[PDB]
Amino acid sequence: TDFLKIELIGRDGSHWVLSGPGMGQQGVTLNPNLQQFYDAPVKTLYVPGPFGEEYAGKRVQRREIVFSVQAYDEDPDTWSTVDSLWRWAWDYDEESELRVSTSDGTRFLKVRLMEEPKPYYEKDPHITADNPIVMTVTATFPYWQDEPEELIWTTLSTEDMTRFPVRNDGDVPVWLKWTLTAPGLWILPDFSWGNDMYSRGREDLGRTVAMPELVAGEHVSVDSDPRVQTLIAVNGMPTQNRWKGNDLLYPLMPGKGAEIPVQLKNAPEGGACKLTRPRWYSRPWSRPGV
Amino acid sequence: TDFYTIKDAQADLAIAPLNLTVLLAPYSTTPATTLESPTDGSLAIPPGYKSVGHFEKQAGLTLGNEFDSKDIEAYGEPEPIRTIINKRTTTFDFAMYQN
Incomplete structure (x- = not known):
């Protein structure tokens, strides 16, 4: 949709448009069902009280975003190039930027590979040249x-x-x-x-x-x-x-x-x-509040 | 080569079971290895096989072959490379008239 644009800037400076206008121009699109992406995970503490438990404060938790992408092209060689570039755009030690741009501006989250990606289908990926990569990234600073x-x-x-x-x-x-x-x-x-x-x-x-x-x-x-x-x-x-x-x-x-x-x-x-x-901000987009 | 010569179709090889009969024997009876008489090549039924008599015409006799198959597909191939026929079940049914 044109109301929302998701981009990734890799650790190497590569620019990918995963959703919104211009999505898939670099060969990688974003799959549905992405988790822990909108609201910052916050846990609340409770101590025993006269009527059950009493609120004792809140703690914000680091984000664990599990999402998926499609790396696609018509020819297997160029698909392999695109897949290698997507893998190069990520790391564990250093973080890559994930920008969400809407009518409320552009807000970014610094994310890193929580564990190794899970690529490809059950068969060899050169057959389809259009394969999903499961990414489990984490945001140490959970705020957008x-x-x-x-x-x-x-x-x-x-x-x-x-x-x-x-x-x-x-x-x-x-x-x-x-x-x-x-x-x-x-x-x-x-x-x-x-x-x-x-x-x-x-x-x-x-x-x-x-x-x-x-x-x-x-x-x-x-x-x-x-x-x-x-x-x-x-x-x-x-x-x-x-x-x-x-x-x-x-x-x-x-x-x-x-x-x-x-x-x-x-x-x-x-x-x-x-x-x-x-x-x-705790959300990729939100209207100003006061 | 012309199409008829390539086809080389023979009508005489089409066999119509004009008169069919079913013979049953107890399991103790020695199985029939062949129905051809060794002395003169006539129809020779082994002893112990008894006919079931007349059976229905419209129903006929139906022979059913059922294949259980498994598809073997390789990691580097989109289609299954092989198929395995694990078993082949044979049945036959008909409608006997006599009591």
Whole structure:
């Protein structure tokens, strides 16, 4: 259909249109009955309670997408070429992109081979030259993503302050990334947005955390993502060591957004701040919500 | 070669069972190896075989051959390479009149 277009960018940069307009131009089409593709798998926890069990929170699970493709051509030699190219477009160590484009834009999922593919029919595939490949791919990050929004603020003043416009249009919280130049003392927002995950939802409404003073050449990446370390110095210095049990704790909650303040002081040569905000969605397509 | 010579069809080889009869014998009777008399090539029925008399004309006698077959197909071939006839069942039926 023209309302939905599914593409794959392989690990080698190959482009395949598996469904939608232009499907099968590269020889590979998408078969029906694809599972764990739309909604992010979330499991809920329950503890015993007075009336049965009480809700105790939710945990999102990694995606296990099991789907199938047809590799087809009129001649067995070119079918073999197409089948080899399709196999080359995948790996276990490194991930390939899977884009879904609809009237709500284009959202992609990074997927890798969970196990070896199951190709061909019961007989040798050169007879039909049109064979199915069963793919069991996995998404370690189960959220459908868009291109992250990047903002740059550079200044030549010793002391300066700016407001970054930030907004979470997705249905899941996102974690902000900062890239701060050195030297200088940076103060970054860590607003809770009403999140009671530390019982300080409104006490931390305007929370700001002051990063340690940076020496020359100590450019820092400050990622609030729990997967990675918060402070990473580009030169290998232990910048987190001089930070005294303080941290970025709060993601950008869905439906929330404001002009978050970033302050720079004691910067003899000015400074540059880069803000990266991810755009995570639980579905390949969804209308905006607020 | 012309078509008639290639065909080389003979009508005399068409045999019509103008008068048919069925003879049954107990299992202890020595089986009939042939019905041709060794001395003069006449019709010789072994002792112990007794006719069932008249039977229906419209029904006739029907001989049924039933084949049980299995298809052997190879991995590198689309059609079955061979067929095996596991067994061949023979039956015959007719409608006897006499009591």
